[PDB]
Design a protein around this ligand. Sequence first.
Ligand code: NAG
Ligand code: NAG
Ligand code: NAG
Ligand code: NAG
Ligand code: CA
Ligand code: CA
Ligand code: CA
Ligand code: CA
Ligand code: CA
Ligand code: CA
Ligand code: CA
Ligand code: CA
Ligand code: CA
Ligand code: CA
Ligand code: CA
Ligand code: CA
Ligand code: CA
Ligand code: CA
Ligand code: CA
Ligand code: CA
Ligand code: ZN
Ligand code: ZN
Ligand code: ZN
Lengths: 131, 263, 263, 276, 276, 276, 276
Amino acid sequence: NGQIINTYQARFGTIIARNFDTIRLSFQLMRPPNMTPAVAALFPNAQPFEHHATVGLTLRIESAVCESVLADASKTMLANVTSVRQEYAIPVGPVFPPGMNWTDLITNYSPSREDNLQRVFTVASIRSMLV
Amino acid sequence: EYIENWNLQNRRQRTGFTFHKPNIFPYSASFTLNRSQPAHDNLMGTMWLNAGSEIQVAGFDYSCAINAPANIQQFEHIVQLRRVLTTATITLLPDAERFSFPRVINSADGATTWYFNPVILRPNNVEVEFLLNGQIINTYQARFGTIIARNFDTIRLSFQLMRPPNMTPAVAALFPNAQPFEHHATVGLTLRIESAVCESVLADASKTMLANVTSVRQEYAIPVGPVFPPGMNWTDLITNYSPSREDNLQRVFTVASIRSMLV
Amino acid sequence: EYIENWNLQNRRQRTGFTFHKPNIFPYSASFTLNRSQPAHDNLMGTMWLNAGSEIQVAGFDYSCAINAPANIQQFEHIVQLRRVLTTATITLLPDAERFSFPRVINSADGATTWYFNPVILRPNNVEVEFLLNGQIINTYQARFGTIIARNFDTIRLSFQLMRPPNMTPAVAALFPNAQPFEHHATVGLTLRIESAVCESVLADASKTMLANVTSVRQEYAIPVGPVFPPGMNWTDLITNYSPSREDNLQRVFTVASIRSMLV
Amino acid sequence: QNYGINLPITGSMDTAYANSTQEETFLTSTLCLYYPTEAATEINDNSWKDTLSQLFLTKGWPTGSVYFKEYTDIASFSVDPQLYCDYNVVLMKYDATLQLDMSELADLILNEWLCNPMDITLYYYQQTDEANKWISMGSSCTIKVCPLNTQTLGIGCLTTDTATFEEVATAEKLVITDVVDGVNHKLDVTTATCTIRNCKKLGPRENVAVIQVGGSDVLDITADPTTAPQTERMMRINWKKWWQVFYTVVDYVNQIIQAMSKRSRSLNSAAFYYRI
Amino acid sequence: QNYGINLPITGSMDTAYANSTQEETFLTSTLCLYYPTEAATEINDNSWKDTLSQLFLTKGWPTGSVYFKEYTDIASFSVDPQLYCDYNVVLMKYDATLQLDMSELADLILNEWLCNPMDITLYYYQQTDEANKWISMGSSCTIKVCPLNTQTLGIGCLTTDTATFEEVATAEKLVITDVVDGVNHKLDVTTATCTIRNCKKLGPRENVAVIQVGGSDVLDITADPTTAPQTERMMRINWKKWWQVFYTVVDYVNQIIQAMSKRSRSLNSAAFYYRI
Amino acid sequence: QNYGINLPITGSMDTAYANSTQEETFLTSTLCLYYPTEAATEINDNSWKDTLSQLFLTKGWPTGSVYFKEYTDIASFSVDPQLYCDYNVVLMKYDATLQLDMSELADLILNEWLCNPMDITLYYYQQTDEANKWISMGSSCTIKVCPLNTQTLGIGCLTTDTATFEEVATAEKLVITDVVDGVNHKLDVTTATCTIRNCKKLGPRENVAVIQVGGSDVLDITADPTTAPQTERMMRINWKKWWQVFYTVVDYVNQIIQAMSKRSRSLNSAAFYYRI
Amino acid sequence: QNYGINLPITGSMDTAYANSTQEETFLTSTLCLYYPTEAATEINDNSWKDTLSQLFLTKGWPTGSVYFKEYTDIASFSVDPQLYCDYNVVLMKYDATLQLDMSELADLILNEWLCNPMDITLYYYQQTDEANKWISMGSSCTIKVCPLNTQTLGIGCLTTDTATFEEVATAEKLVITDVVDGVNHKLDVTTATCTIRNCKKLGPRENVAVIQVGGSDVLDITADPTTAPQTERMMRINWKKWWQVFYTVVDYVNQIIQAMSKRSRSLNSAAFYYRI
Ligand SMILES: *[C@@H]1O[C@H](CO)[C@@H](O)[C@H](O)[C@H]1NC(C)=O
Ligand SMILES: *[C@@H]1O[C@H](CO)[C@@H](O)[C@H](O)[C@H]1NC(C)=O
Ligand SMILES: *[C@@H]1O[C@H](CO)[C@@H](O)[C@H](O)[C@H]1NC(C)=O
Ligand SMILES: *[C@@H]1O[C@H](CO)[C@@H](O)[C@H](O)[C@H]1NC(C)=O
Ligand SMILES: [Ca+2]
Ligand SMILES: [Ca+2]
Ligand SMILES: [Ca+2]
Ligand SMILES: [Ca+2]
Ligand SMILES: [Ca+2]
Ligand SMILES: [Ca+2]
Ligand SMILES: [Ca+2]
Ligand SMILES: [Ca+2]
Ligand SMILES: [Ca+2]
Ligand SMILES: [Ca+2]
Ligand SMILES: [Ca+2]
Ligand SMILES: [Ca+2]
Ligand SMILES: [Ca+2]
Ligand SMILES: [Ca+2]
Ligand SMILES: [Ca+2]
Ligand SMILES: [Ca+2]
Ligand SMILES: [Zn+2]
Ligand SMILES: [Zn+2]
Ligand SMILES: [Zn+2]
């Protein structure tokens, strides 16, 4: 909600975010003040620029806890609901996006969609006990 | 109504608060310039006031679409409601009276001021779309007066400034082929939510719960807390209407309605 | 509500009538010229409409504060309410659409007519003060949208016409250094009371008590009495809201609410 | 009754309109026509003033209310013009060679000017603001100016040597000088045949109208280059005969007076502001 | 139509615009270009009419729609001008000496006029309203006016002795006389040379546009000194050669016609409606 | 930073006006004054430039920022004038005989023209839209045009005989030619003496203002007959002494610069739009 | 555009490609081929321009789009080169004795430059940044440099005696001078014969491509000794005849234009942006 809960500076590896809804990754491309002849050759003082400096970060959420249902790499609730909807040619309804596409569903994860999705995921978990 | 909605929500059934003129839009008098330059004498863009239950929007072109493809300039205005509204009665009127008089407006960065000299043309190809999750729930084309938006969280007003193909000499005198453009063609739209239903609590024109809470906090000099903005400013509150803010607001509004029964 | 207030009043307890758009301002479309001359070409002053629950005020300067002490022209409007209002929700908007188009206006004595050609500038240093017994109860500086006035009987709207320090060539063309002044710089303010609470009875946009009393009096050709204006006219009644008038009006409004239960 | 103070006046936006006061204004006011001598020459009629008075009487002006004042030409008339009637109309013939002279004349009579004396011998003079000008009138005005600096020494001029002064007027009957504001100037003026006054432009002179008889719109009553306002009191007519011009003036006198208002400075309300 | 002229016409402010009617207007209208003889002289070409017609065809006017009418000068063209087709464009060369004659011609052809005969030999005449004028034209007009009084006695002019009348025109090919209203006037006119009619200005004329070639804004199509309206049909251009002028007229013919309106062409080509 | 892409701007009201930037602009910008030679001749002083620089320094302009460029006359100045200062003010003397040339010069310097080359020997040329003109400049431009038809045959002219062409310019030092759009024209121009270019009017040039010294409003910077716009950058002043002209220019430099804007095209943002 | 220049532009990496715009680019652009005089001499044909235009039309360029400009030699073309149209292809004949002159011309016309006047007769000058150079051109440039110290005293050169200055150019039609930064320099230049400007290299110029006819890779468009970039706009071909060169240019015009970018053309054809 706009308040910094966790902050990690120059840390890499495993980190813990205890409670959050926003991620802010700030980094910098610093020109190396001391360059060997090849490095200095890569970066001229003016155009043309043939080699382009890039600084990257990778963030991977391995585990989390959410008050709402979500698709994840381990469970099969989304797969089961989508499979059932596809196998019986269920026409698109007024709640979920066509084909149960996860990107559209999570882009506009509204309270009504949350209620319907929790309902169907709970039913799918019930069904997976037997089928 | 408030205690009934409290009990229904504690049971997680639909709760519905009915609002006359719901205070759903935070105040914002803003403009967008799609075509501009430092002299601000050949401008194309939009200016709007979104305030309370009301939205006045106006698309202006200084050239009057002289060089626009097919002599039509398309304007769009998207307003995202912070909460989903249902069973909403809307009055849509062709013109926006607020942006139809001469006006000296500030620059976007405040460095200078530009001039606006509207001449109002009827909006063309008006389409009011009421969207839910990006899907068109209601669509109204060239329809004005009372309309019903049954369930929506976004409003899309698309309207066109169409250059009159045939002009009388007095009209033709206003829109030359090139600059200077003394008269600037403006199309408008006014959208007023007379009544609606929301699952969340909102300020509205008929109820006094926001007024009661604000009065109680001001009278006893309650220090600003970690939830609400200072002075319970409704614009700030509705702009960032977070779930925690919604819970606290519902609590205090229910308490205020309880207090109103006696005080 | 009306019988509750009647019984509370008979015991001398705090009474409360809740009004949606209370009709508290007697109708008045007036102007004040702080600077004027026989030809009415260099005018500084204010024009306002106070109607029902609405106040539209506009300060105009024909010279656009060119010779003002700091290129600031200060305008002030004081509205004294005939009764104290509490728990009031108020929409405040920058512009006054009613005084933003060309007008031909009678002189104060009706001897001649002058010309008004507004160009609307953004009001500067807007300070809305809600006063009780001459003391400042609520203050809102540069705040627009919905505001709360918890307890007040007077409204003081102070605003300023500030000459833009930087002008584009068109804007600079509108405002010369000396006369003639063809475009007259106008700043505005709109103030709507959406809802309020008053210890006294008032006509509003939701209840039908005034309409019922007036209709009964007109249907049976009741001769004018010694208490009410000779049409049951609301402007005269609210202008001179005496204690005797208030007592009689509460009586008749309570009886009208009783009648409306059956008729 | 309360003369030295500016008290606000409140009016209701719905009171009424009083009846037309044009007839009473014509009955109780005076009209002055200013025209060049060549107009009288071309008319070549001894009783033409009487005929014009009769025609004005047909328009509601009582006999003797309308006066006709002759002037030789624009330049001569520009020497301290005195417009004393309630309503003044000046027929000014257009000369393409005298555009600035006509502009200065109109600026002098179409505006209100508050003038203080100038003693160029004793003092150095600035112009404080945009409304400050130096108006000089006489049989022949020749104004030369030396702009000083913060040390009182001339810029491109020597205070002692007038030969280096920068001439801004030469044998003018009337000239309005505008110099850079905030800069002290030493002035050399032909005081024998010309008086110079430090004047402030208060505002329009409501009761003076100038009808330009002839060419296109050339008057510039504003010293500012960016603006050349054409007020309703700056009329312009095309002509070939002076009798036609005077008949037009008489026939449309209602419109001409309508374009004019009573001099705000000439009524009791102006008392103790500057004059009456 | 006449029976329903005094009937309301109600329209909705949401009725879809019709398509452009410019093409249909050109395909069914006729255009007249009035130019002075000096234009054709300076062009010095005999097929230029065909070239202009072909250029107009490129601009959408079918062959045969555009007509070219020549006039010697402003004075000669003012003798009962004839406007022949749906759209009339008059190229008027500017001259600083004939400002009033240009104004008179523009007033005559840019407005509707309702004229009646004036038997100046028999009756005295009045101009009842501001819209009433006396338009006289022919080989040479010399109008002398003697205002009268309630007893028919002339004011500043003996009725019998025309030599004492007041001269308003001399050898004019066209003149619009405007005398004081409500006063009977005796008129002496060169009836053998030119005719005078009592005319009323009905309103503007939409099918006639005047393009002033060179000069400044000098036309005054209203006798009122306070007003010098510059309508959309009064264009002005700068020129060094006439071919550029004609190419400008052809290239911007759409704009010129836009400034003009249909239904303004009367059945006859005259410059006024005559009632005898 | 993001050049070549038009990004919408979404400013708001109530952002509060910033303080005056006039002082900062005067401090950081340069001003060029363009005046005729006769101005310096009449002034007749060898330090007048220094005095005007000092007077401008009194108005806020740092010393060395105001430049004084001289031109012989309008014709010579119309030979591809290069206005390079941040703000350019051109003091242009009025001549009744050079109205079109004055208009052409103003149109060339008061507007922005994207010009591409013209090789009349190799190709035929047409003006596609109303913003397309042919601008020719040099010692002497004589342009003759032969309109062609769809059969690439001259209309009223023979493609092989230039004597039958139509003359649109003669001995001009600057001329703007507007021909009928959508028609191919063969061109005969004195290429050895002057150069022609196909130029599109993009829009106003804001850093250039023209002060017409004396005269009336005669400029027409638009080829449209129906439009004669007097923008805020076209001042007119009545004059007798050039010293008064320069004092007026310096004293109202605030107003003059307010009427102008930084050249929208000559700044970092226009990078990859046309320049910089 | 300008107000939103400092705004982000966001793009999805899955947005479908638009169709080829090459056809539209050719149908709306203009191409200039700059070739030496020896090329036209060796071709020895008077209609070769028509043939090349027709071949370009076969390649998609509408007739009139392609232009051919001749220059005598590298030296003459370097005197204020003018780049006229949207796409400029410069055929530069290689000469082993003029490597630096070719490099200077390529640097001038392949990069954007922002230049200011240098009053070398009054002030000493510095090159503040590596992007700052001094570009001088004209009939004959001879630049002598005297580096100064903190006390203005020249280093290895007396300030008064120019003969002891340091020669950096001799009779050059164009030279780009690069002195040590942070050191004030006194300059002696043949101002009567050639002009010198203080210039800053803004960046590359996309609308200008240079094809080196014959030779080797010798251009060095950057002053830095460590960098000799060979951009996509610096082509090189081998030749025995000029017709083969022109056919190669026509046949691979698509590839040449691909190496160039739109929007780099400036209103003016100048090789730099001048600020005074
Ligand atoms: C004003 O005009 C009216 C209408 O003609 C007339 O009856 C009345 O007497 C006039 N005078 C006054 C003082 O109202
Ligand atoms: C008007 O134009 C439209 C659009 O080209 C076309 O469909 C229609 O047929 C035209 N005519 C009418 C009478 O609408
Ligand atoms: C702006 O002007 C005000 C008053 O003129 C002054 O106090 C202030 O310091 C100035 N600067 C800023 C950044 O507001
Ligand atoms: C692009 O090319 C495709 C394929 O030929 C064609 O269908 C389409 O109309 C072209 N134009 C656009 C704007 O996509
Ligand atoms: Ca001197
Ligand atoms: Ca004078
Ligand atoms: Ca001054
Ligand atoms: Ca002026
Ligand atoms: Ca005549
Ligand atoms: Ca007589
Ligand atoms: Ca009359
Ligand atoms: Ca008139
Ligand atoms: Ca010319
Ligand atoms: Ca021919
Ligand atoms: Ca054209
Ligand atoms: Ca024009
Ligand atoms: Ca060299
Ligand atoms: Ca040495
Ligand atoms: Ca260096
Ligand atoms: Ca290098
Ligand atoms: Zn802006
Ligand atoms: Zn008044
Ligand atoms: Zn309501």
